[PDB]
Design a protein around this ligand. Structure first.
Ligand code: ZN
Ligand code: ZN
Ligand code: ZN
Length: 231
């Protein structure tokens, strides 16, 4: 069964195997006196690994690298951050010092700089217009349009039919909108429909926080966003 907060204390990281050569990584962080979980992805690319997102902070990200070497034993050579917030880029400096090449879209890199957050080194081309997709090793990267943030990317693993939605997709147990200070509420439902149109065959869907499910998570997120819009 999928790990939850009660089973992970801050500073530790769990790995969960989704399919052959595809794992999620789960970590926790405190904020405002509550404890929140957070997901990223690991995908095998021959004899190397691609990482999607940090584990939300420098200490957690060092623990993530140690857990990968203990449990998988292959080198992490590249990492992609899916938007500019600290649960996605916090820990980029640890990755860089370990020899991992770090990547994000130019939009993400600019917004991280304005915020004073850590800045991935390399710029991903071909993702500036809504509906754009590019291949990056064993995954496809897709820019659906503005949603949780103006820069948010989603990631698809074709060999395993795994769709990683990041923070643009909510878990089923979340019934109210989360942090929306940087969101585009007007465009978020349209961006979700672009994901459904491009990846209708997805079998596993991973939100940025909480439990995986199926494609139902997309309509669920639209329902929650529209209710918040009508507040
Ligand atoms: Zn975010
Ligand atoms: Zn998030
Ligand atoms: Zn729902």
């Amino acid at each position: 069964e999928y790990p939850t907060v009660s089973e992970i204390p801050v500073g530790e990281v769990r790995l969960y195997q989704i399919a052959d050569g595809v794992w999620s990584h789960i970590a926790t962080q405190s904020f405002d006196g509550a404890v929140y979980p957070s997901n990223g992805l690991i995908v095998r690319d021959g004899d190397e690994l691609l990482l999607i997102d940090t584990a939300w902070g420098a200490k957690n990200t060092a623990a993530l690298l140690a857990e990968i070497e203990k449990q998988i034993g292959l080198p992490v050579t590249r990492a992609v951050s899916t938007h500019f917030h600290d649960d996605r880029v916090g820990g980029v400096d640890v990755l860089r010092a370990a020899g991992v090449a770090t990547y994000a879209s130019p939009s993400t890199r600019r917004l991280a700089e304005v915020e004073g957050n850590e800045i991935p080194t390399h710029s991903l081309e071909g993702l500036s217009s809504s509906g754009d997709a590019v291949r990056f090793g064993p995954v496809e990267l897709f820019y659906p349009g503005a949603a949780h943030s103006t820069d948010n990317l989603v990631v698809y693993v074709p060999s395993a039919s795994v769709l990683y939605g990041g923070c643009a997709i909510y878990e089923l147990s979340r019934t109210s909108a989360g942090n929306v200070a940087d969101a585009d509420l007007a465009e978020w439902p349209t961006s979700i429909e672009r994901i459904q149109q491009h990846y209708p065959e997805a079998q596993f869907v991973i939100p940025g926080h909480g439990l995986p499910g199926g494609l139902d998570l997309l309509k669920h997120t639209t329902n929650v966003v529209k209710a918040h819009t009508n507040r």
